[PDB]
């Protein structure tokens, strides 16, 4: 299935890192300290596609760990999910692992296919977790740049 390696940075130039075994944190990184930043494998999966909207999965480079969207206290929640490493990645990923990648003026948004109008968001502050957020509007950050890596 077509995959691209990539890092993500938020519109404020916070870089993404592994907090716990299962959280991402966003933080202002520079220098060699930049090593510490998480590389995704982004997969082109089966879904509703427009020029403007592309369904992707977001895995970590050589870990069987995928971002999924799941209900946790009657709230959409973002988690890192362990998968069977022989069975993944797939073209037909399960709906919780699917994001619509949306290009909206050199920036990306990642909408959950599973919770419409829920986006991968970061905090304005340092060292807070990446979350599923439902409110686009000058508060939490919902847009990203993408960098390719010579994988």
All structural domains of the chain = 1-151 (2.80.10.50)
User: For the chain, what is the radius of gyration of the CA atoms?
Assistant: 14
Task: Mark the breaks in the chain: residue after which each occurs, C to N over 2.5 Å.
Answer: none
Both structure tokens of 81: 């999910």
Q: How was this structure determined?
A: X-ray
- Beta-sheet strands, E only, within the chain: 3-10, 14-18, 24-28, 40-44, 53-60, 65-71, 76-82, 99-103, 108-112, 119-121, 128-129, 131-133, 144-148
Q: Is 79 exposed, middle or buried (0-12, 13-18, 19+ CB in 10 A)?
A: middle
- Residues 54, 69, 26, 1, CA torsion sign: negative
Give the span between the Cα atoms of 138 and 65, in whole angstroms: 30
Q: Is 151 exposed, middle or buried (0-12, 13-18, 19+ CB in 10 A)?
A: exposed
3-state secondary structure of 135: coil
Longest dimension (CA), the chain: 41
- Residues 120, 125, 126, 128, CA torsion sign: negative
Q: Is 123 exposed, middle or buried (0-12, 13-18, 19+ CB in 10 A)?
A: buried
């Amino acid at each position: 299935v077509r995959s691209l390696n990539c890092t993500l940075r938020d519109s404020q130039q916070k870089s993404l890192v592994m907090s716990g075994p299962y959280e991402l944190k966003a933080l202002h990184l520079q220098g060699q300290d930049m090593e510490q930043q998480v590389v995704f494998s982004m997969s082109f999966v089966q879904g509703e596609e427009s020029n403007d909207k592309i369904p992707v999965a977001l895995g970590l480079k050589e870990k069987n760990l995928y971002l999924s969207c799941v209900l946790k206290d009657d709230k959409p929640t973002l988690q890192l999910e362990s998968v069977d490493p022989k069975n993944y990645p797939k073209k037909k990923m399960e709906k919780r692992f699917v994001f619509n990648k949306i290009e909206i003026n050199n920036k990306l948004e990642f909408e959950s296919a599973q919770f419409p109008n829920w986006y991968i968001s970061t905090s304005q502050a340092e060292n807070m977790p990446v979350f599923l957020g439902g409110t686009k509007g000058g508060q939490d950050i919902t847009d990203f740049t993408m960098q390719f890596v010579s994988s």
